[PDB]
Structure formats: C-alpha cells, structure tokens
C-alpha cells in the first residue's frame, strides 16, 4: 500500500534513500498487535485514531492528555495519517502530568502495570511499549524496563535529547530494551540526540508531524519522536510474523539501512530503522 505526500519520517523508514515522499507498507499495518504508550496520555477521541485508541490507566486526577506529548507519540505509532502501524491497537498509560513531568516511582509503576495488564488484552500478534521519556541514571528505572521487556513486551525507549552519551540516562541506558536515537530529514544525527554504545538504532526525530490535543496536529522534534517510529515498526513487523517481541530490536537493527547517517560519533551504531517493504 502506499501513502503519498506522507510525513517525511514515514517515507524515510520505507526507503533506502532520503528525499522521498511516499510511505510504502503492507496492508496488514500492525493489525492484531498492541502498543502501550506510556506518556502524558492519549486524546482517544481524536478522529485520527479511528477508535483504535483508549486510556487504560492514569496516575493522576484525570486520564486526559492535557499536554499533547503523549497524543503526538501515539499518533506516530498508529494514527491513520501520521502513523507507522495504521491498524494497531493503542493503549494509553498516563505516567506523566500535564507539564510532561513524572516521578521515577510513578514511571516504574506504569511499566509494571503494562507487564501485567497485557495479560487481560487480546493482542494475538504481540505487545509493544513505547517510552518517550527519561531522566538521569537510575538502576531502579532501568530494572523496571528490563522486567517489562523480559515479561514479553517489545520495549522501545528514547535515547534522550542532551547531545551526550546515553549511558548516563534511564531507561535509555538499560541494555536489554531498544534505545532509539534521532535523525533529521537529511540523514544527519539530530543535533540534540544522545549517542553512545548503548544505542540500538536511529529513527526520524526532527520536525515530525503528528496528532495533537484539541483534535489538531503539529510538528515537534526529539528522540521522543523517533521512539514511536520504532515501536510502530516493531508492531508492524510482528504482525507480519517476521520477528517476536524478544528479538524485534535485533531484527530491526539487522535489517536497517547501514551507514547512511552522518555526524555519528565513533562507537555509535550507524543504523536507521527500515521496513524493507517490497511490493
């Protein structure tokens, strides 16, 4: 299937070269898979979700996304126009307040919730968790991420926007999950993107158009943008039966576009998420 004039990020992950504008993907589109977006929540009523999105858990007074960050990421995962896996089921877990803030204990609680909750859902093709958040290193946060991944959920996390080594950040520094770096439309590492040996892969993260609250849309940047591209791609590949939750990150790295990125520090992988679609 093909989406013409698609956001540059979608086009990029379905091409071996930059500069294209069509997003090629298999019609299955992640149907049968589920993706938990652990963020500020999701405006589930947004037309772009077609009813495929719903809040399942909040750690605050409301389950409503009063920020927009979570709705933006969820849209990149599976909104009809801005998403990678256009048919996947989205579940929102509000672990961040409407200012985009959250305490480590709440974030950890959110991760354990998903590990257990996935057992109450019907996701025959597999479960993914997208975590576009992070802070300073913490062995407890890293550990919570490792548990979620271990329970059978494909965990994708943002590398961070400090233009530094992601070793000092969590859950970015947990080796067992999928740490996502950010790239721009000209195949350059995003200027704010963290790097380092712990990164597993890069995804489009600069000037990403997606859904926003109030039923709108807007373009923003960050490794938080990149992470849902990979979470969505994983759900897409799992639905296709190409990989499983335990090996998705590795499969994505093996089949990525190699050496296409510039301004990648020595010691950091030069790999860009790619769906390898062939019609």
């Amino acid at each position: 299937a093909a989406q013409t004039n698609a956001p540059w990020g979608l086009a990029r992950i379905s091409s071996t070269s930059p500069g294209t504008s069509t997003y090629y993907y298999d019609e299955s589109a992640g149907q049968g898979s589920c993706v938990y977006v652990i963020d500020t929540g999701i405006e589930a009523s947004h037309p772009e979700f077609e009813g495929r999105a719903q809040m399942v858990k909040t750690y605050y007074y409301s389950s409503r996304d009063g920020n927009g960050h979570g709705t933006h990421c969820a849209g990149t995962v599976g909104s009809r126009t801005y998403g990678v896996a256009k048919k996947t089921q989205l579940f929102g877990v509000k672990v961040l307040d409407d200012n985009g803030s959250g305490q480590y204990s709440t974030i950890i609680a959110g991760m354990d919730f998903v590990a257990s909750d996935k057992n109450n859902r019907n996701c025959p093709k597999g479960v993914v968790a997208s975590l576009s958040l992070g802070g300073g290193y913490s062995s407890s946060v890293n550990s919570a991420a490792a548990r979620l991944q271990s329970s059978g959920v494909m965990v994708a996390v943002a590398a961070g926007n400090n233009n530094a080594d992601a070793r000092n950040y969590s859950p970015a520094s947990e080796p067992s999950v999928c740490t996502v770096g950010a790239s721009d439309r000209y195949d350059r590492r995003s200027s704010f993107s963290n790097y380092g040996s712990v990164l597993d892969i890069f995804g489009p993260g600069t000037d990403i158009l997606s859904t926003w609250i109030g039923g709108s849309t807007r373009s923003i940047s960050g490794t938080s943008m990149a992470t849902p591209h990979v979470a969505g791609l994983a759900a897409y590949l799992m639905t296709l039966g190409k990989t499983t939750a335990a090996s998705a990150c590795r499969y994505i790295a093996d089949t990525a576009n190699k050496g296409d990125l510039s301004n990648i520090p020595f010691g950091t992988v030069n790999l860009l998420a790619y769906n390898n679609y062939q019609a």
């Binding site: 961040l96 985009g100 576009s132 958040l133 992070g134 926007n161 704010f192 923003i220 960050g222």
Partner: peptide, 10 residues
C-alpha cells in the same frame, strides 16, 4: 520525566 516536553525547543 527528567527529559523533555516543555514546548520552546533546542
């Protein structure tokens, strides 16, 4: 948190 979402970028 400890990351982002603030809305005037860098």
């Amino acid at each position: 948190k400890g990351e982002a979402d603030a809305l005037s970028l860098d």
